Scaffold this motif. Structure first.
Motif, PDB file in Angstrom:
ATOM      1  N   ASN A 143      16.632  -9.173 -65.604  1.00  0.00           N
ATOM      2  CA  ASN A 143      17.097  -7.754 -65.660  1.00  0.00           C
ATOM      3  C   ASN A 143      18.431  -7.591 -64.921  1.00  0.00           C
ATOM      4  OD1 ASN A 143      14.332  -7.627 -66.482  1.00  0.00           O
ATOM      5  ND2 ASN A 143      14.057  -5.535 -65.709  1.00  0.00           N
ATOM      6  N   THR A 144      19.165  -8.689 -64.725  1.00  0.00           N
ATOM      7  CA  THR A 144      20.447  -8.542 -64.075  1.00  0.00           C
ATOM      8  C   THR A 144      21.320  -7.649 -65.010  1.00  0.00           C
ATOM      9  OG1 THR A 144      21.088 -10.801 -64.742  1.00  0.00           O
ATOM     10  CG2 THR A 144      20.288 -10.503 -62.427  1.00  0.00           C
ATOM     11  N   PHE A 145      22.330  -7.036 -64.412  1.00  0.00           N
ATOM     12  CA  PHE A 145      23.231  -6.146 -65.148  1.00  0.00           C
ATOM     13  C   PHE A 145      24.470  -6.932 -65.138  1.00  0.00           C
ATOM     14  CE2 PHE A 145      26.822  -3.114 -64.717  1.00  0.00           C
ATOM     15  CZ  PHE A 145      26.606  -2.365 -65.860  1.00  0.00           C
ATOM     16  N   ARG A 146      25.050  -7.206 -66.296  1.00  0.00           N
ATOM     17  CA  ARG A 146      26.177  -8.134 -66.310  1.00  0.00           C
ATOM     18  C   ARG A 146      27.467  -7.361 -66.512  1.00  0.00           C
ATOM     19  NH1 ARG A 146      25.380 -12.047 -62.702  1.00  0.00           N
ATOM     20  NH2 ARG A 146      23.430 -13.185 -63.089  1.00  0.00           N
ATOM     21  N   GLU A 153      23.055   0.913 -52.717  1.00  0.00           N
ATOM     22  CA  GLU A 153      22.973  -0.018 -53.834  1.00  0.00           C
ATOM     23  C   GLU A 153      21.611  -0.026 -54.551  1.00  0.00           C
ATOM     24  OE1 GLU A 153      25.726  -1.438 -54.786  1.00  0.00           O
ATOM     25  OE2 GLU A 153      26.827  -0.949 -52.934  1.00  0.00           O
ATOM     26  N   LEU A 154      20.568   0.483 -53.899  1.00  0.00           N
ATOM     27  CA  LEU A 154      19.219   0.327 -54.429  1.00  0.00           C
ATOM     28  C   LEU A 154      18.928   1.143 -55.695  1.00  0.00           C
ATOM     29  CD1 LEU A 154      16.538  -0.131 -51.642  1.00  0.00           C
ATOM     30  CD2 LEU A 154      17.430  -1.822 -53.304  1.00  0.00           C
ATOM     31  N   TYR A 155      19.489   2.333 -55.815  1.00  0.00           N
ATOM     32  CA  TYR A 155      19.272   3.143 -57.037  1.00  0.00           C
ATOM     33  C   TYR A 155      19.557   2.356 -58.309  1.00  0.00           C
ATOM     34  CZ  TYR A 155      20.274   6.857 -60.496  1.00  0.00           C
ATOM     35  OH  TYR A 155      20.344   7.616 -61.629  1.00  0.00           O
ATOM     36  N   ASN A 156      20.696   1.665 -58.341  1.00  0.00           N
ATOM     37  CA  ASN A 156      21.029   0.810 -59.514  1.00  0.00           C
ATOM     38  C   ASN A 156      19.934  -0.213 -59.825  1.00  0.00           C
ATOM     39  OD1 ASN A 156      23.457   1.941 -60.239  1.00  0.00           O
ATOM     40  ND2 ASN A 156      24.648   0.613 -58.874  1.00  0.00           N
ATOM     41  N   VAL A 157      19.390  -0.818 -58.789  1.00  0.00           N
ATOM     42  CA  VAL A 157      18.397  -1.883 -58.933  1.00  0.00           C
ATOM     43  C   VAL A 157      17.076  -1.340 -59.389  1.00  0.00           C
ATOM     44  CG1 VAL A 157      17.022  -3.605 -57.686  1.00  0.00           C
ATOM     45  CG2 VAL A 157      19.496  -3.443 -57.347  1.00  0.00           C
ATOM     46  N   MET A 158      16.677  -0.203 -58.821  1.00  0.00           N
ATOM     47  CA  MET A 158      15.517   0.524 -59.275  1.00  0.00           C
ATOM     48  C   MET A 158      15.642   0.932 -60.747  1.00  0.00           C
ATOM     49  SD  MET A 158      14.266   2.548 -55.900  1.00  0.00           S
ATOM     50  CE  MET A 158      15.724   3.568 -55.847  1.00  0.00           C
ATOM     51  N   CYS A 159      16.809   1.417 -61.148  1.00  0.00           N
ATOM     52  CA  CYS A 159      17.109   1.637 -62.573  1.00  0.00           C
ATOM     53  C   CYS A 159      17.017   0.353 -63.426  1.00  0.00           C
ATOM     54  CB  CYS A 159      18.471   2.301 -62.765  1.00  0.00           C
ATOM     55  SG  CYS A 159      18.501   4.012 -62.228  1.00  0.00           S
ATOM     56  N   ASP A 160      17.574  -0.741 -62.935  1.00  0.00           N
ATOM     57  CA  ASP A 160      17.498  -2.056 -63.605  1.00  0.00           C
ATOM     58  C   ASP A 160      16.039  -2.510 -63.796  1.00  0.00           C
ATOM     59  OD1 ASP A 160      20.253  -2.372 -63.751  1.00  0.00           O
ATOM     60  OD2 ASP A 160      20.391  -3.612 -61.986  1.00  0.00           O
ATOM     61  N   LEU A 161      15.243  -2.348 -62.743  1.00  0.00           N
ATOM     62  CA  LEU A 161      13.816  -2.692 -62.776  1.00  0.00           C
ATOM     63  C   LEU A 161      12.978  -1.906 -63.784  1.00  0.00           C
ATOM     64  CD1 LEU A 161      13.135  -3.157 -58.963  1.00  0.00           C
ATOM     65  CD2 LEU A 161      13.180  -4.934 -60.633  1.00  0.00           C
ATOM     66  N   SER A 198      37.395 -18.776 -58.426  1.00  0.00           N
ATOM     67  CA  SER A 198      36.459 -19.692 -59.096  1.00  0.00           C
ATOM     68  C   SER A 198      34.991 -19.183 -59.003  1.00  0.00           C
ATOM     69  CB  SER A 198      36.581 -21.079 -58.459  1.00  0.00           C
ATOM     70  OG  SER A 198      36.251 -21.029 -57.061  1.00  0.00           O
ATOM     71  N   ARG A 199      34.767 -17.995 -58.428  1.00  0.00           N
ATOM     72  CA  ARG A 199      33.430 -17.499 -58.121  1.00  0.00           C
ATOM     73  C   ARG A 199      32.918 -16.574 -59.231  1.00  0.00           C
ATOM     74  NH1 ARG A 199      32.163 -21.281 -55.564  1.00  0.00           N
ATOM     75  NH2 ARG A 199      30.347 -19.982 -55.060  1.00  0.00           N
ATOM     76  N   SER A 200      31.604 -16.493 -59.373  1.00  0.00           N
ATOM     77  CA  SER A 200      30.972 -15.605 -60.365  1.00  0.00           C
ATOM     78  C   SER A 200      31.259 -14.130 -60.031  1.00  0.00           C
ATOM     79  CB  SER A 200      29.461 -15.821 -60.381  1.00  0.00           C
ATOM     80  OG  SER A 200      28.909 -15.337 -59.164  1.00  0.00           O
ATOM     81  N   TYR A 201      31.331 -13.285 -61.046  1.00  0.00           N
ATOM     82  CA  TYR A 201      31.744 -11.905 -60.806  1.00  0.00           C
ATOM     83  C   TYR A 201      30.713 -11.155 -59.922  1.00  0.00           C
ATOM     84  CZ  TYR A 201      33.635  -7.208 -61.546  1.00  0.00           C
ATOM     85  OH  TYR A 201      34.113  -5.899 -61.414  1.00  0.00           O
ATOM     86  N   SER A 202      29.433 -11.437 -60.080  1.00  0.00           N
ATOM     87  CA  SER A 202      28.427 -10.782 -59.243  1.00  0.00           C
ATOM     88  C   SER A 202      28.552 -11.146 -57.779  1.00  0.00           C
ATOM     89  CB  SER A 202      27.012 -11.061 -59.754  1.00  0.00           C
ATOM     90  OG  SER A 202      26.815 -10.330 -60.944  1.00  0.00           O
ATOM     91  N   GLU A 203      28.913 -12.397 -57.503  1.00  0.00           N
ATOM     92  CA  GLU A 203      29.153 -12.822 -56.132  1.00  0.00           C
ATOM     93  C   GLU A 203      30.353 -12.096 -55.536  1.00  0.00           C
ATOM     94  OE1 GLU A 203      29.357 -17.136 -55.185  1.00  0.00           O
ATOM     95  OE2 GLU A 203      31.213 -16.740 -54.097  1.00  0.00           O
ATOM     96  N   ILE A 204      31.385 -11.936 -56.342  1.00  0.00           N
ATOM     97  CA  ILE A 204      32.591 -11.228 -55.933  1.00  0.00           C
ATOM     98  C   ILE A 204      32.234  -9.767 -55.679  1.00  0.00           C
ATOM     99  CG2 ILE A 204      34.875 -10.376 -56.818  1.00  0.00           C
ATOM    100  CD1 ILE A 204      34.680 -13.386 -55.532  1.00  0.00           C
TER     101      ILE A 204
END
Ligand SMILES: *[C@@H]1O[C@H](CO)[C@@H](O[C@@H]2O[C@H](CO)[C@@H](O[C@@H]3O[C@H](CO[C@H]4O[C@H](CO)[C@@H](O)[C@H](O[C@H]5O[C@H](CO)[C@@H](O)[C@H](O)[C@@H]5O[C@H]5O[C@H](CO)[C@@H](O)[C@H](O)[C@@H]5O)[C@@H]4O)[C@@H](O)[C@H](O[C@H]4O[C@H](CO)[C@@H](O)[C@H](O)[C@@H]4O[C@H]4O[C@H](CO)[C@@H](O)[C@H](O)[C@@H]4O)[C@@H]3O)[C@H](O)[C@H]2NC(C)=O)[C@H](O)[C@H]1NC(C)=O
Ligand SMILES: NS(=O)(=O)C1CCN(C(=O)N2CC3=C(CN(C(=O)c4cc(OCC5CCOCC5)nc(C5CC5)c4)C3)C2)CC1
Ligand SMILES: [Ca+2]
Ligand SMILES: [Ca+2]
Ligand SMILES: [Cl-]
Ligand SMILES: [K+]
Ligand code: NA
Ligand SMILES: [Zn+2]
Length: 805
Positions: A483-486, A453-461, A786-792
């Motif tokens: 910098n969240t990705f929605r 999962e970290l590559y995406n976050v490093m890209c986001d950063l 009822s939950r946010s998509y990122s949590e899901i």
């Protein structure tokens, strides 16, 4: 050839690598024997060491020194990292109270917060607690930033596969670095730790972070350091690059430490000799942070502290030898150690047989410390098959052990007390994650997650668009302040049909029978209501799964369960049902043992038939919704519909029956109800992805009924177990599995015993993420919560691992 007669004057640690025969001055030139003649003199200075002392403050600039304490050093970008502390009354970064970084606090001309990735080889997760007294800098980053209690590496839990997974977001099967040692039969070439073949670009697939950055106009520091460049110089080189002018200055940097892995191999993960290497890594972290503080970058840069894998206790006396099992031990090549990979020694040997090798390694000794698998039968959670460099025959070695071919391999090579490479769910293999900076959260603990999962976050950063990868983009949004990705939910591709009663009984010629000829207006409307979905809210809790590929399927409602029935595969893609804590388990009545019933909503032409199972002497059948959990005698007839039947080997029905009769109820009792979604998986080319019809290699004999490679279940309930699964107001809890659908139970060495002694252990081994099932099915789950998509998304990447604390 290298014309080493050029000079590194003014070029030390240059960012653009010059090409042969010209001589190099970059941080890798040593590793290619290509540095210019004067690289050591100019670029690897050591005089007077790494720290300012009182007596050097304000000195006359001497260019021979490794670092400087003269008044001009801040403007030249080459002070020793402690210069301000010793010479200007400043405090070390570690001694400062931690203060929330709400916004980036950067010098003028910085377009974005830089990212510095600090990777530590062999840094086992428990070091964060067990070593905390000797790692004050690391502990400050950890407690003041964002941290996970551990991060799960990829399998195998070896160095190069994990570092390149960190770089790419890809599973080793996809990036190509499937071990530290490899043979590629297409290339006919071998990759090793030692030597030159590993530098050839053709081993390395995907798109690593430094290439992704470069393609989108973000400048990258060179990520790799030749082993003889000491850590102090690596840090000084990073800090120097950070003083470059804006148009030349990288935005992303990497530091790599060989420690604590190096000592861990020698001394074991908790050897008394491990305290010093941990101290020394901390001191390096202190240098970097003091150095950033000097440059006024300590509230500007995002720092990631990350490990590749852990370290386990392993000694030479805990080695299994293949010579103790195989007669023909000289006809094979083994890749050995903490995993095994076997292939024929000679491609000209037509007397090579994988099947006899597997049989000779299967449950042969009572304590056997490895298990053989054909790669396609490995737990799907390992994603370790779809590469020609992964040998068909694999050995999963027990933690604390090695496998080797012959005893002579172990002494003509005890030495070592530590190793790694084992199954990536093993606790000793887990590693570390810390994020610190303006873009990460303040004093935040996050759940364990996978290093994919970290590559995406490093890209986001860095504001980069990630290349396609195995992360689930958004699943780590909860690590970040900004910098969240929605992401949006994928669009459903095929809409279901909702068939009503369309066929008379006598239109079916399926060769099935059922003792169901037994006859009331009160309950007649009620059964009509159930077939139209009056109980669907009870059994389909999170919306129907979305079908993300083009197909023809029907929603079928029933009192106790709902299904999405594929007219192409002749069976459900998914079957959904809720079992409360209070539900009762019942038997299959004697009279209904072989009962299978035509479904009057589905044509004969799109139905299975009993005759095929009768004639297929290998293949039997089971049901997706379990008849054992019927809500009443009358409802139980629904469970014997031909539209709820799926093909199952008798050996596999032992597993399946136990799951359905015993374990579902156990889970419901423990979790205060569960919702179950079960179904088939077809992955004949073992690529982790849903097969199309033309990829299916096996049918029920004489029919078009395809044979699943696996069966899955997704078992969901309320995280707050005081609420029942079917009235949950908050976050969810999930566990899932992908069981191999095999004609024997050779994998389970205790399978001659009662199912209560081996089935659950099998299931635990084949634990899975919802996301793994999504890939394998083309379905998208949890569409209506009822939950946010990122949590899901976080929920969908969860893996229930079954290790202790
Ligand atoms: C994890 O994430 C990754 C990344 O998203 C997922 O992997 C992707 O999955 C796709 C589907 O499997 C796959 O798409 C195929 O790519 C073919 C061209 O690919 C090249 O170009 C890309 C782009 O730069 C590159 O990344 C590829 O790199 C691979 O190969 C080199 C060596 O050649 C390796 O060095 C590298 O590591 C990587 O290897 C891995 O992937 C390959 C597959 O590409 C595996 O074989 C390896 O074992 C290893 O795992 C390539 O250089 C493209 O041509 C395909 O198109 C065919 O299929 C379509 C269906 O839409 C069909 O209509 C076409 O007709 C076409 O078929 C024709 O070719 C067939 C094959 O010869 C032939 O039999 C037919 O008869 C036809 O002639 C297809 O689009 C994508 O490449 C990979 N990407 C990566 C990086 O691996 C992965 O699925 C995720 N995992 C999970 C579990 O979710
Ligand atoms: N193999 S073993 O027995 O465990 C033992 C053998 C001896 N071993 C040993 O001596 N070494 C191994 C080693 C070096 C130097 N290396 C690198 O510079 C490097 C750093 C790196 O970073 C990636 C970052 C991406 C972002 O996320 C962060 C990481 N990627 C790579 C390769 C994947 C491309 C190399 C790797 C020396 C150490 C390991
Ligand atoms: Ca390593
Ligand atoms: Ca497939
Ligand atoms: Cl390996
Ligand atoms: K049969
Ligand atoms: Na067995
Ligand atoms: Zn190692």
């Amino acid at each position: 050839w290298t014309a080493t007669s050029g000079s590194c004057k003014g070029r030390c640690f240059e960012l653009q690598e010059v090409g042969p025969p010209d001589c190099r001055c970059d941080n890798l030139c040593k590793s290619y024997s290509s540095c210019c003649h004067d690289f050591d003199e100019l670029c690897l200075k050591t005089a007077r060491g790494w720290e300012c002392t009182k007596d050097r403050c304000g000195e006359v600039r001497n260019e021979e020194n490794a670092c400087h304490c003269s008044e001009d050093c801040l403007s030249r970008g080459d002070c020793c990292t402690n210069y301000q502390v010793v010479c200007k009354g400043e405090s070390h970064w570690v001694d400062d109270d931690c203060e929330e970084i709400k916004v980036p606090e950067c010098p003028a001309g910085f377009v974005r917060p830089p990212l510095i990735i600090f990777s530590v080889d062999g840094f086992r997760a428990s070091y964060m607690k067990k070593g905390s007294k000797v790692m004050p800098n690391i502990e400050k980053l950890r407690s003041c930033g964002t941290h996970a209690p551990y991060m799960r590496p990829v399998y195998p839990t070896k160095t190069f596969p994990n570092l390149y997974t960190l770089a790419t977001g890809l599973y080793p099967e996809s990036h190509g670095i499937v071990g530290n040692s490899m043979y590629d039969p297409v290339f006919d070439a071998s990759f090793h730790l030692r030597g030159r073949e590993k530098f050839n670009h053709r081993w390395w697939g995907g798109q690593p972070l430094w290439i992704t950055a470069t393609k989108q106009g973000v400048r990258a520091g060179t990520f790799f350091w030749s082993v003889s460049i000491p850590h102090e110089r690596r840090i000084l080189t990073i800090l120097q690059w950070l003083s470059l002018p804006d148009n030349e200055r990288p935005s992303v940097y990497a530091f790599y430490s060989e420690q604590p892995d190096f000592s861990g191999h020698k001394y074991g993960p908790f050897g008394p000799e491990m305290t010093n290497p941990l101290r020394e890594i901390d001191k390096t972290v202190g240098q970097l942070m003091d150095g950033l503080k000097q440059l006024r970058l300590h509230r500007c840069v995002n720092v990631i502290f990350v490990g590749d894998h852990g370290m386990e206790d392993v000694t030479c006396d805990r080695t299994e030898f293949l010579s103790n099992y195989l007669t023909n031990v000289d006809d094979i090549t083994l890749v050995p150690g903490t995993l095994g990979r076997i292939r024929a020694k000679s491609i000209n040997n037509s007397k090579y047989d994988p099947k006899t090798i597997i049989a000779a390694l299967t449950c042969k000794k009572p304590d056997q410390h490895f298990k053989p698998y054909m790669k396609q039968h490995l737990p799907k959670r390992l994603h370790y098959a779809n590469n020609r460099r992964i040998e068909d025959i694999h050995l999963l070695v027990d933690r604390r052990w090695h496998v080797a071919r012959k005893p002579l391999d172990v002494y003509k090579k005890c030495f070592f007390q530590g190793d790694h490479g084992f199954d990536n769910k093993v606790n000793s293999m887990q590693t570390v994650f810390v994020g610190y900076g303006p873009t990460f959260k303040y004093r935040t603990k996050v759940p364990p997650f996978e290093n994919i999962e970290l590559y995406n976050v490093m890209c986001d950063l860095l504001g980069l668009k990630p290349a396609p990868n195995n992360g689930t983009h958004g699943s780590l949004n909860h690590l970040l302040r900004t910098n969240t990705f929605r992401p949006t939910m994928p669009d459903e591709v095929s809409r279901p049909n909702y068939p009503g009663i369309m066929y008379l009984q006598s239109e079916f010629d399926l060769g099935c029978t059922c003792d169901d000829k037994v006859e009331n207006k009160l309950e007649e409307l009620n059964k009509r209501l159930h077939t139209k979905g009056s109980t669907k809210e009870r059994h389909l809790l999170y919306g129907r799964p979305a079908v993300l590929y083009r197909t023809s399927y029907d929603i079928l409602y029933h009192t106790d369960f709902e299904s999405g029935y594929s007219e192409i595969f002749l069976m459900p893609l998914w079957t959904s049902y809720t079992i409360s804590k209070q539900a009762e388990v019942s038997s299959i009545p004697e009279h209904l043992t072989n009962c299978v019933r035509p479904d009057v909503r589905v044509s004969p032409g799109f139905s299975q038939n009993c005759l095929a199972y009768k004639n297929d002497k290998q293949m039997s059948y089971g049901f997706l919704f379990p008849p054992y959990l019927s809500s009443s005698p009358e409802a139980k007839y629904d469970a014997f519909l031909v539209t709820n039947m799926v093909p199952m080997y008798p050996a596999f029905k032992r597993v399946w029956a136990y799951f359905q009769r015993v374990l579902v109820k156990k889970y419901a009792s423990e979790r205060n109800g569960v919702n179950v979604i079960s179904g088939p998986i077809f992955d004949y080319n073992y690529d982790g992805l849903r097969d199309t019809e033309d990829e299916i290699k096996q049918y029920v004999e004489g029919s078009s009924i395809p044979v699943p490679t696996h069966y899955y279940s997704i078992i969901t309930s309320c995280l707050d177990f005081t609420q029942p699964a079917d009235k949950c107001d908050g976050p969810l809890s999930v566990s899932s599995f992908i069981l191999p659908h095999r004609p024997d139970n050779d994998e389970s060495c205790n399978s001659s015993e009662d199912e209560s002694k081996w089935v659950e252990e099998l299931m635990k081994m084949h634990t899975a993420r919802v996301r793994d099932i999504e890939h394998l099915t083309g379905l998208d789950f949890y569409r209506k919560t009822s939950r946010s998509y990122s949590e899901i998304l976080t929920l969908k990447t969860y893996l229930h691992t079954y290790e202790s604390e």
